[PDB]
Amino acid sequence: SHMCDAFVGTWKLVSSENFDDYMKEVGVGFATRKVAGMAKPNMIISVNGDVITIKSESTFKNTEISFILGQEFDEVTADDRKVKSTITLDGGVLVHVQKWDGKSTTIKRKREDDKLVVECVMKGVTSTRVYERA
Ligand SMILES: Cc1ccc(Cc2cc(O)[nH]n2)cc1Oc1ccccc1
C-alpha cells in the first residue's frame, strides 16, 4: 500500500459550486466557460511506482497528467494555458500548483468520507467540486 491509495480509482463529478467564477478569475473566456461548466467529467487516478496519473474524461476535453510528487512538469490545461505544475502531498491532501504568466492557482484534492473533494483557488475565489466513485 502507498501514498495515494485512497485516491486511486474512477470517480464521477456529482456537484460543483462557484466554478464559473473560478474560471473567470483564471482568465477562461466565455465560450470555454460555458462548455466546460456543462461537463460532467470522470477523473481516473492510478499509481505505478512513483508515477501518479490523473486523467479527466468528458465531452469537453480528455486530459491526462503523469507526475512524480515534488517534481515540476509542463502541463497544457483543458482551457489551453501552458503552465508549470508541481504536485505534492501535504498531510494527506494532493496539492497541485500551476504557474503561468506571473499568475498562480492551486487545486487541492482530498478524500472526505466516500467523496473526493476538489478545491480550486485563484486569489480570493474558491470553487468546490465533489466526486463520487463511479
Ligand atoms: C478549465 C479548468 C480549470 C480547472 C480545472 C481543475 C479541475 C476541476 C475538476 O473537476 N478537475 N480539475 C479543470 C479545468 O478544465 C476542465 C473543466 C471541466 C472538465 C474538464 C476539464
Side-chain angles (χ1 to χ4, degrees):
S1 286
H2 247 248
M3 55 208 191
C4 291
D5 275 359
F7 295 100
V8 164
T10 306
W11 301 89
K12 58 177 187 276
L13 182 71
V14 302
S15 68
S16 184
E17 287 289 352
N18 300 298
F19 191 57
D20 188 61
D21 287 349
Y22 168 79
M23 288 190 287
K24 285 187 173 177
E25 208 68 7
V26 168
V28 182
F30 180 89
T32 299
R33 292 200 314 282
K34 297 300 113 169
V35 174
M38 287 288 299
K40 297 290 190 155
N42 296 139
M43 180 184 327
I44 308 142
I45 302 175
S46 60
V47 182
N48 183 323
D50 292 336
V51 183
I52 302 166
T53 301
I54 303 176
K55 296 178 90 163
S56 178
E57 294 188 334
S58 73
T59 64
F60 169 56
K61 294 290 166 175
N62 298 319
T63 65
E64 176 176 332
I65 60 171
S66 295
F67 59 91
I68 297 175
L69 295 167
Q71 303 195 356
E72 186 166 49
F73 60 99
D74 281 321
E75 178 182 6
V76 176
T77 67
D79 57 309
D80 285 324
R81 286 173 287 130
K82 272 57 69 167
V83 306
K84 290 191 178 290
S85 288
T86 309
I87 303 179
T88 57
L89 211 35
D90 169 35
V93 177
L94 281 166
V95 181
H96 179 178
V97 183
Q98 297 178 329
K99 304 300 194 184
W100 76 106
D101 297 348
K103 300 168 185 144
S104 185
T105 188
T106 299
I107 304 159
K108 290 183 180 177
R109 297 172 179 93
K110 66 188 59 138
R111 278 294 311 272
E112 188 184 307
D113 303 318
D114 286 324
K115 301 167 162 24
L116 187 169
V117 179
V118 184
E119 290 172 350
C120 301
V121 174
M122 174 70 182
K123 289 154 74 196
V125 177
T126 307
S127 169
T128 301
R129 286 170 60 101
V130 178
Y131 289 76
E132 289 185 38
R133 285 200 186 270

